[PDB]
Amino acid sequence: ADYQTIYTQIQARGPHITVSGEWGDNDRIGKPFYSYWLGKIGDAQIGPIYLGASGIAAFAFGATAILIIGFNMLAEVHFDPLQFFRQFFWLGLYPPKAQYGMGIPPLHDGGWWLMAGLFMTLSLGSWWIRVYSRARALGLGTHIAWNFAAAIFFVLCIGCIHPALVGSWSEGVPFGIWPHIDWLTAFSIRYGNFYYCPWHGFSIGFAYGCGLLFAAHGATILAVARFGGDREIEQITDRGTAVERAALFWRWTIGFNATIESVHRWGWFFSLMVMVSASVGILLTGTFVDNWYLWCVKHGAAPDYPAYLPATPDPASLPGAPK
Amino acid sequence: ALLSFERKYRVRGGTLIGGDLFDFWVGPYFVGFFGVSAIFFIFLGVSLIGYAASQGPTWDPFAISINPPDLKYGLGAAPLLEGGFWQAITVCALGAFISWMLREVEISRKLGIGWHVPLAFCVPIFMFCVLQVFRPLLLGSWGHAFPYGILSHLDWVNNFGYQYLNWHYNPGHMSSVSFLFVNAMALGLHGGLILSVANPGDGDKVKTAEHENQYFRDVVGYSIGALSIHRLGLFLASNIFLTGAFGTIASGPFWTRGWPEWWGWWLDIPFWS
Amino acid sequence: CFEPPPATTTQTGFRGLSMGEVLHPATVKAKKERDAQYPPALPAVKAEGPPVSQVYKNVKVLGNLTEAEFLRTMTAMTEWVSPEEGCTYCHDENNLASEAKYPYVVARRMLEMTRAINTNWTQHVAQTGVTCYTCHRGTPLPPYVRYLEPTLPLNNRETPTHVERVETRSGYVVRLAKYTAYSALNYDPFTMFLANDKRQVRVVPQTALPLVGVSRGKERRPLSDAYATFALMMSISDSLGTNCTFCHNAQSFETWGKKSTPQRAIAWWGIRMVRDMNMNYLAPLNTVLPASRLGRQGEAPQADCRTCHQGVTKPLFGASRLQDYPELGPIKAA
Amino acid sequence: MYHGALAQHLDIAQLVWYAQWLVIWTVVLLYLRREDRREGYPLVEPLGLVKLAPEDGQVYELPYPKTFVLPHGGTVTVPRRRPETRELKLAQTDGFEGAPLQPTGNPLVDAVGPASYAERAEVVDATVDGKAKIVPLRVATDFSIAEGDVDPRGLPVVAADGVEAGTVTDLWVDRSEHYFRYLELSVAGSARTALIPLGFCDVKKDKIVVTSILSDQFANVPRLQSRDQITLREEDKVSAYYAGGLLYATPERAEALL
Ligand code: BCB
Ligand code: BCB
Ligand code: BCB
Ligand SMILES: C/C=C1/c2cc3[nH]c4c(c3C)C(=O)[C@H](C(=O)OC)c4c3nc(cc4[nH]c(cc(n2)[C@@H]1C)c(C(C)=O)c4C)[C@@H](C)[C@@H]3CCC(=O)OC/C=C(\C)CCC[C@H](C)CCC[C@H](C)CCCC(C)C
Ligand SMILES: C/C=C1/c2cc3[nH]c4c(c3C)C(=O)[C@H](C(=O)OC)c4c3nc(cc4[nH]c(cc(n2)[C@@H]1C)c(C(C)=O)c4C)[C@@H](C)[C@@H]3CCC(=O)OC/C=C(\C)CCC[C@H](C)CCC[C@H](C)CCCC(C)C
Ligand SMILES: CC(C)=CCC/C(C)=C/CC/C(C)=C\CC/C(C)=C/CC/C(C)=C/CC/C(C)=C/CC/C(C)=C/CC/C(C)=C/CC/C(C)=C/CC1=C(C)C(=O)c2ccccc2C1=O
Ligand code: HEC
């Protein structure tokens, strides 16, 4: 076997490299240090990190959201530290339970939730500027930032755009470990079974597709590490036997193949489309479709099955039934 | 027609079984013994699906459903129209998958590359087996397996989740989902990074391995490196199923209650109850 | 931490839909052994002599019984409700006609409720029916009751920890979670849905597209209603020791016909039965029970699904005493 | 009335279903699948044709060429014409067009099959500041081996036949990634050094084990033009030779494994 593909048998150490960017060189902090054990499976060097105004702002806004959520969770256990720790996963900061439409809810029924959502958004925005700016500063394209923009957009869809489109803050995602999970079921139930939403399906096909493609691509490059396949940029600019063999592996297996550059386009696209597809689904839900299962029945697509135990009429529809 | 660099690689050898008998290409596709067995299983399986579908109520592709037997048949053969088609198609699927994987090994060998791809492909085959063979064996009936239908498979997933009240609280599911998400995200990051270096814009110069590492050191304070992000990507993707498999196997054979109640191990410790 | 195999599994839907009960044999066996403590029916007595409406002084519900039959009912009530305390839990030993002890008047109302359940709610209890034992299981206070706020332990025969107590505010989320099968759902489905008939359980639209006039802004139910229905459903499931597929094909929770089992229609009647019991029989006992029995808002303890079912899909695995004790119902008209 | 309902029994989500498939197939077929053809195309014909009259299809499947501006000067444009010249020491095993080829000589020296290398540039890969990227520790004096790992300098290289093939003299490090890529060894009974990629090396405390080739095959490893630097083409040549051994080190390796 190529043991190098499992771990680095002999580690190298040398002087730290710094690449100058257009601005910000004096805003890096930390003194790099090395981990021997990390160096078995990754680069041994940890740090330094760029600071900068946008990352500072991301932390300020993020910390404020975290404090708002945190202090509300604490209120939920009446400020008992031991019960906080115990009950943590079950604790949450919730959107309005009552229907006030798009009216700013009172603090005791959604208002803190809305405030947390605002600071979280400001935090993501600020981080996005960091992700985009660092690329420009180092003379790189902004591919990562466009992919990150789509993930942010999706969070905005389930957090506030869909709420705004149906006209109710009560529909937003709660903050909390189990509470954000419980939202998934309430949402799927209210909108008629998210398995019947095509965009849920497309998002999944892309997410599973990312699984498939990162397994395949990661395994492919490991299988050609012996010919320097991992040196991808110079394989793009000067095709070597590594990527000739990679392409032929696939061509011979599935009948077609990518190039070392374009396989990264496919990965970037699949990843993007997890979030694009989910967002379209969310924007259509409640706005233009109320029950996805019924929408699939209407359009001829839902499977149907025989009764196993007897078919059961709705008792509310029987003669003489109570309400 | 061959890729311009292809001919020099199109040599005899590298087979597992069969030697020179099936060591040829048909168009772009390598054949080999396992190409012949893949095709056989595909032909049988697909034909079986056509004939089963024609005995049901619909030709709509979304609505077609070929289902396993009733629980009461346990692990035995079922009549064709009461689960037997499904049994037959399952054996074909497994043989097609395994044939596909072993053919990938031959192609690897001929090219002198590692066997990492077919090894990685064993993970989804293993998960298929968890869902359709190992869990049904542990519960005692083929009828616990999932049906073959574009949408009907989702109806099975759905009811199975709800059989444990809220499947989201399954610890093995939480791991699987975390790996699913982090992997999608990491594929985006990796893809975007390589493209950002190769395509700076505006007739600017292509950048370097050093700019790649600088970018992430700057953004998150660590860069894993060019070879290692591929190892990582294979690890993350693989663990979607390697951890999920425990969540699936646990549900029924090792836990019969709702999943949320599983967390009473934490919540109900006398110290803080 | 985990439950060792084998599992018992049933089928409740078309093959290949993963529908059915999933059960642990040792749990089933322990519930069967608990439930098998239902005392056997007392020996049948001959019907003879005048109705007790003629013989005794203050008999208002069971006046048609003969003496032997009536005393047999009293013996059974004592076995079922106050076997540790005996006849004098309800009676003054020196005047059996005296109503001076509060359990006497409550017992009389309970007799009426029981007779109402077995006569008017056969769509739920069929010919299995209920007795006093179904809820009480041998103690004056039934083990599984609900107040207007969540309480722990669910079985009021277990001693509470400090945090379990309803006065310890820090424990609230756990009181809620253990009533909704350990979920984090931030709703108490008992007060919302079972105490009375003010709220609709249904939350899913019955059209593909959204109807203009009920789908925007303040027209809409808040998403909280969907979480609250899910909470109820988690609670019901746990109260019967079952899962969602006992009643539903999750393909469409909202659909009846082939997408629902006969048990779902039985459940629907059960909700109506419980609301009736609670509004018309149990809630109004707060004017008769001692302060010490009331919750913190002055309410009488009330019934939910668990009160009878106690973790089994049929209370007591379907054991019945209906023909042994016909004075508990069904009562013929006229 | 219903939100989303349109004329002619249509609804908005239904239209979006069609639009989404159109977007997906457009990006996949018209964009991605053409990016996939920046290398290797147009395809090469077993018999005649090509130049005589290229098919319309050969133009339709190609993207417009892009030009990379390189970090240290020059440019590269893809796709572009890259016919391969070197006579291939391969013969047809059978007449039909998908039959495999077979070596007419020593395939490791002839560089065919899994012993094949690509026609990469005869340029030394560079660091970001323009120095040689992959260099031996005798030149990369500011690099070292991590404490805790094996220093293979001095160790015997034991080949697939179990015979000692030579002695490790140095390691070649990638100064851009801080990563060892080759070991350099003195070849026993020849008067030369040879490089070996670390991916072909099982590094033990007391030996380097190499199963890809036999001991006597180290004499024909491709030679570098210069002692202390390596071109991209040389790297491809050196790696390919060991890879060839996996199929060709003995007559048995090409034949069915099981
Ligand atoms: C435990 C949970 C499971 C699950 C949960 C699941 C969900 C929740 C959803 C899917 C969806 C999908 N699943 Mg399923 N599924 C599928 C196939 C599929 C597709 C119909 C679709 C998109 C998948 C995709 O792009 O993947 C990534 C792979 C890619 C992108 C490569 C291309 C694959 C190609 C689209 C596969 C096409 C399959 C054929 C229609 C099936 C017939 C093959 C024969 C007859 C030729 C197969 C073939 C299997 C097998 C063999 O086990 C499987 C098992 C499972 N699914 C489990 C049972 N699946 C989604 C959907 O839209 O369903 C309608 C969806 O929402
Ligand atoms: C019973 C309910 C169910 C449900 C409910 C559900 C809902 C309601 C929604 C999904 C959605 C989706 N579902 Mg589904 N689902 C999925 C898969 C998926 C995803 C592909 C997609 C979610 C998008 C995502 O990637 O989120 C993970 C990625 C996220 C959340 C992006 C975050 C990025 C962000 C920039 C990160 C920021 C982090 C900051 C550091 C944090 C700052 C902290 C603050 C406090 C300062 C599978 C594979 C299955 C199976 C196997 O059954 C399934 C079943 C179910 N889903 C059930 C049917 N699903 C979504 C969808 O597609 O709808 C159409 C969706 O909205
Ligand atoms: C209401 C019920 C729910 C549910 C029920 C559910 C169950 C019952 C199970 C999962 C499982 C899983 N769920 Mg969950 N789930 C997931 C995510 C996921 C996955 C990460 C994970 C594994 C999927 C799998 O087994 O694929 C399997 C895919 C296979 C086997 C593919 C085989 C491919 C084959 C080898 C090749 C096929 C080739 C084609 C036939 C070829 C076609 C030819 C063409 C292309 C030429 C998310 C992200 C969510 C969200 C967002 O809520 C969600 C919600 C839910 N899940 C609900 C709560 N989920 C599984 C798990 O791991 O649980 C721990 C699982 O068992
Ligand atoms: C399909 C594609 C996907 C995708 C894509 C991409 N995803 C990206 C990018 C791309 C392309 C990036 O470029 C960006 C990045 O940089 O990558 C390195 C990023 C990100 N993906 C994150 C997480 C994530 N992605 C998820 C999902 C997907 N992503 C999907 C799957 C999921 C889930 C739920 O699945 C999660 C959790 C973060 C790591 C990161 C954002 C950090 C942020 O926005 O931070 C902003 C927030 C902070 C800085 C908070 C700081 C709080 C401090 C530490 C705590 C203070 C404590 C104390 C209270 C203070 C007291 C104060 C005192 C003085 C009084
Ligand atoms: C964790 C890592 C993972 C991972 C990894 C990898 N994945 C790989 C490889 C690696 C490494 C490859 O090398 C191999 C390949 O070559 O890639 C291009 C492959 C492949 N991944 C496939 C599909 C795929 N991967 C999924 C998941 C993951 N992949 C996860 C995420 C999923 C889902 C649902 O998630 C799907 C659908 C094909 C595209 C391909 C197999 C072709 C095949 O086997 O051909 C042989 C078989 C056929 C062509 C048809 C067989 C027809 C049978 C007889 C009859 C049908 C029966 C069937 C049961 C009916 C189902 C109906 C349905 C509605 C329920
Ligand atoms: C009843 C009946 C008639 C039945 C049918 C019978 C039948 C099948 C007959 C056909 C007989 C024929 C024609 C031939 C016999 C020989 C034979 C074995 C044929 C096989 C035919 C067959 C079964 C084909 C199907 C192939 C197949 C499973 C294709 C799926 C392709 C899919 C969906 C892939 C998903 C992943 C994906 C999005 C990939 C796109 C991106 C690519 C191509 C990545 C690959 C790739 C990666 C990952 C790199 O890292 C890389 C790095 C550097 C350079 C290149 C690459 C590279 O190409
Ligand atoms: C469940 C639906 C019940 C059935 C059937 C019967 N009873 Fe009941 N009982 C039930 C509740 C919810 C309550 C209120 C809680 C309480 O303990 O007060 C009661 C109460 C009584 C009492 C008073 C107990 C006490 O407070 O000390 C008595 C005496 C009583 N019930 C008697 C009784 C008899 C005789 C029944 C069969 C005819 C009977 N109950 C049925 C719940 C249920």
Ligand code: HEC
């Ligand atoms: C039978 C004992 C049931 C079990 C177990 C579960 N549910 Fe149920 N469900 C049941 C009934 C009788 C009703 C209707 C009540 C009424 O008064 O109309 C319901 C309703 C739902 C709904 C609402 C459907 C709608 O039309 O809006 C949902 C979403 C629902 N049930 C889901 C659900 C889940 C997730 C369960 C397991 C956790 C579950 N139910 C159990 C009967 C029974």
Ligand SMILES: CC(C)=CCC/C(C)=C/C=C/C(C)=C/C=C/C(C)=C/C=C\C=C(C)\C=C\C=C(/C)CC/C=C(\C)CCCC(C)C
């Ligand atoms: C314009 C107007 C009127 C209002 C603002 C509009 C706006 C932008 C609203 C945006 C709302 C959005 C995007 C809401 C989205 C919410 C989402 C997607 C939430 C999702 C998931 C959340 C999860 C899993 C959160 C878990 C959080 C925790 C576990 C936090 C724990 C915090 C602590 C332990 C801190 C302890 C600190 C101690 C001192 C108390």
Ligand SMILES: CCCCCCCCCCCC[N+](C)(C)[O-]
């Ligand atoms: C982000 C898009 C905003 C579109 C506005 C759609 C209006 C929905 C109805 C809002 C009614 C709520 N209100 C005003 C009563 O509070």
Ligand SMILES: CCCCCCCCCCCC[N+](C)(C)[O-]
């Ligand atoms: C998002 C802004 C915060 C809400 C704005 C309204 C002010 C709070 C008034 C609500 C009533 C106060 N309280 C605590 C009872 O909720």
Ligand SMILES: CCCCCCCCCCCC[N+](C)(C)[O-]
């Ligand atoms: C959500 C966005 C909120 C704006 C606050 C963030 C401020 C960061 C701006 C710094 C920009 C510096 N720059 C131009 C060099 O990138």
Ligand SMILES: CCCCCCCCCCCC[N+](C)(C)[O-]
């Ligand atoms: C659908 C696959 C597309 C992969 C390429 C993504 C391109 C969009 C990002 C362009 C921004 C890059 N740049 C060089 C201008 O900064």
Ligand SMILES: CCCCCCCCCCCC[N+](C)(C)[O-]
């Ligand atoms: C994940 C859910 C996917 C369900 C897709 C439902 C498609 C509806 C659009 C028309 C389908 C056409 N038809 C009649 C062939 O069924």
Ligand SMILES: CCCCCCCCCCCC[N+](C)(C)[O-]
């Ligand atoms: C529902 C998820 C959508 C994923 C799309 C799948 C893309 C695979 C396309 C391969 C096309 C191959 N080819 C040679 C015909 O172009």
Ligand SMILES: CCCCCCCCCCCC[N+](C)(C)[O-]
């Ligand atoms: C792949 C493992 C298969 C496990 C099957 C073990 C039990 C088989 C029982 C045979 C039943 C006989 N019959 C005729 C009903 O099929």
Ligand SMILES: CCCCCCCCCCCC[N+](C)(C)[O-]
């Ligand atoms: C994962 C390997 C499977 C091991 C099989 C364990 C045996 C238990 C099977 C239950 C008995 C089968 N039966 C008779 C119910 O059909």
